[PDB]
Structures are given as structure tokens and as C-alpha cells.
């Protein structure tokens, strides 16, 4: 069994569901931004989903990242951005401004405030539906209250369920993406390139996902997935100690899973 820095860890055969690795797999902790995995999931599960639907970037999205000094995708107020582009902004650079734009768009209500509450309601429903018992969301980005928790097992199950969507898989394995946005004056703008925060996509052969995460209480987290020889391993590492250690914990666990 590999020794990892993270205090919570889990991994399974994505195809069979057979547990491969365990370390406090059912102890709840803070998720931080790994929470965006569920935002993506809920969005992609909407009946009224249209990847080509444009969204105007509101001043609110911008002020939000500032008020919370959160990670962002550098969305420009006034710009029209497609739902598909927002999914790359959410998952690659971990854009909290993009997460907000998505919650506001797919929540149900007459005000932005009403719609984000309804959206977070959806996130929690999608969890219950997965038959989860240790997961609870209080935000759409993971930057909201201590009532935002999960466990290495629940989160892995949430990721495995999202990896079932082809658009999700396409996004999560992309190393770089350059959004071409429509401007206030109707012109095309070339945004600065978004690079994926997940280093495994470049350091670990076969790596296909899924999403990094961090926070004041969540520390450094990583939900990984790699496929080798037709066998795909998927897992989660919660509360590792550094960006490098998070990727290391994951690498050690995956190497262990593939050789079992
Ligand atoms: Na991160």
C-alpha cells in the first residue's frame, strides 16, 4: 500500500466499481473547488441544455471573484460567452466567475439570487440521487460555508458519474483552450489562453482527468482518472499538503491501482 500525504484518499476501477485504494475514504472533509465537478455535472444534465447558448457576462460575476479573491477565467463584463466556453472556463482554470454564470443560467427563479439558491438545491439533489450520504453543498464553487463537505468515496462516485458524459470527458482532458468571445460591440475577441490546472495531464501517461481543488480548509485536493490497457482508475485525494504533493499522492495511488 502506498503512503500518501493526503489525509483522505480513494480509488476504484471506474468500469467495475471495485475499490482499489482506501484511506479514511468515508470521513467527511471540506471540498473547496473540487465542488465545481458537480456544477458541471448538473449543468450537463439539464433538459434545456444548449452548448451553443450565449451568456452575457454580468458585473456580478466579476465582483464576486474580487470579493472572494477566488480563482477566475477572466471573463469580461459585457461579453457574450457560450455555455460550452463557460464549461472550459469552469474546469480548466477553475473559474469561479464562470461557475456563477452557470448557476445563474441554469437555476430556476426570477432573480439571480433565487436562481443560484435553486441551482445549489439541484447540486444537493443530484447527490442524494447518487445515493450519497456524506456530501452536502452550500455553494456553486466550493467557496461557501463549512456546510460544504464530502468524502474521498462520494466525490469519486460523483466524478465517475460525470465521466459518463462525453462533453465532460472532452473538457476535463483538455490541457489548453482559447475562448473566442463576442464583445459588447459585436466584435470577436481572442481571450488569453486557459491552461488546465491538472498537471497529471502532462506528467502521467494515460491521464484523462479530472479536476484539482483547494481552499483554506480543504487544502490541496485532486480528483484523478487515468486509463491504461482498457482499464481506467478513478479516485480522489483530499487535503494533501501542496500542489506537488497532491499530484504525487495521486500518481502513487494510480500506479498502485494499475498493478494490483
Ligand atoms: Na486549484
From Swiss-Prot:
GO cellular component: extracellular region
Record localization: Secreted
Main location: secreted
Enzyme class, UniProt record, top EC level: hydrolase
GO BP term (any one): peptidoglycan biosynthetic process
Binding residues for substrate: 211
Pathway terms, separated by semicolons: Cell wall biogenesis; peptidoglycan biosynthesis
One Pfam family from the record: Peptidase_S11
Catalyzed reaction equations: Preferential cleavage: (Ac)2-L-Lys-D-Ala-|-D-Ala. Also transpeptidation of peptidyl-alanyl moieties that are N-acyl substituents of D-alanine
Active site: 33 (acyl-ester intermediate), 36 (proton acceptor), 94
Result, substituting residue 94 to A: Almost no activity
Keyword annotations of the record: Carboxypeptidase, Cell shape, Cell wall biogenesis/degradation, Hydrolase, Peptidoglycan synthesis, Protease, Secreted, Signal
Keyword Signal attached: yes
Effect of residue 36 to H: Almost no activity
EC nos: 3.4.16.4
Gene Ontology molecular functions: serine-type D-Ala-D-Ala carboxypeptidase activity
Gene3D superfamilies per UniProt: DD-peptidase/beta-lactamase superfamily (3.40.710.10)
Positions of disulphide bridges: none
SUPFAM superfamilies with a match to the protein in the record: beta-lactamase/transpeptidase-like
Annotated family: Belongs to the peptidase S11 family.
Chain's role: Removes C-terminal D-alanyl residues from sugar-peptide cell wall precursors.
UniProt-recorded name of the protein: D-alanyl-D-alanine carboxypeptidase
Organism for this UniProt entry: Streptomyces sp. (strain K15)
Amino acid at each position: 500500500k502506498p503512503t500518501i500525504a493526503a489525509v483522505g484518499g480513494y480509488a476504484m476501477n471506474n468500469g467495475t466499481g471495485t475499490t482499489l485504494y482506501t484511506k479514511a475514504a468515508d470521513t467527511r472533509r471540506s471540498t473547496g473547488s473540487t465542488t465545481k465537478i458537480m456544477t458541471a455535472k448538473v449543468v450537463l444534465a439539464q433538459s434545456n441544455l444548449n452548448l451553443d447558448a450565449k451568456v452575457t457576462i454580468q458585473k456580478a460575476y466579476s465582483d464576486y471573484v474580487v470579493a472572494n479573491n477566488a480563482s477566475q477565467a477572466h471573463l469580461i463584463v459585457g461579453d457574450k460567452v457560450t455555455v460550452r466556453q463557460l464549461l472550459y472556463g469552469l474546469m480548466l482554470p477553475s473559474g469561479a466567475d464562470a461557475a456563477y454564470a452557470l448557476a445563474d443560467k441554469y437555476g430556476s427563479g426570477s432573480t439571480r439570487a433565487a436562481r443560484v439558491k435553486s441551482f445549489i438545491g439541484k447540486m444537493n439533489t443530484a447527490a442524494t440521487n447518487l445515493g450519497l450520504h456524506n456530501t452536502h453543498f452550500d455553494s456553486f464553487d466550493g467557496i461557501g460555508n463549512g456546510a460544504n463537505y464530502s468524502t474521498p468515496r462520494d466525490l469519486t462516485k460523483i466524478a465517475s458519474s460525470a465521466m459518463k458524459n462525453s462533453t465532460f470527458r472532452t473538457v476535463v482532458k483538455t490541457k489548453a483552450y482559447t475562448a473566442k468571445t463576442v464583445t459588447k460591440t459585436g466584435s470577436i475577441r481572442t481571450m488569453d489562453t486557459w491552461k488546465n490546472t491538472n498537471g497529471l495531464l502532462s506528467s502521467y501517461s494515460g491521464a484523462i482527468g479530472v479536476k484539482t481543488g483547494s481552499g483554506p480548509e480543504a487544502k490541496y485536493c485532486l480528483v484523478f482518472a487515468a486509463t491504461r490497457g482498457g482499464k481506467t482508475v478513478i479516485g480522489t485525494v483530499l487535503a494533501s499538503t501542496s500542489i506537488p504533493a497532491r499530484e504525487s499522492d495521486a500518481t502513487k495511488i494510480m500506479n498502485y491501482g494499475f498493478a494490483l
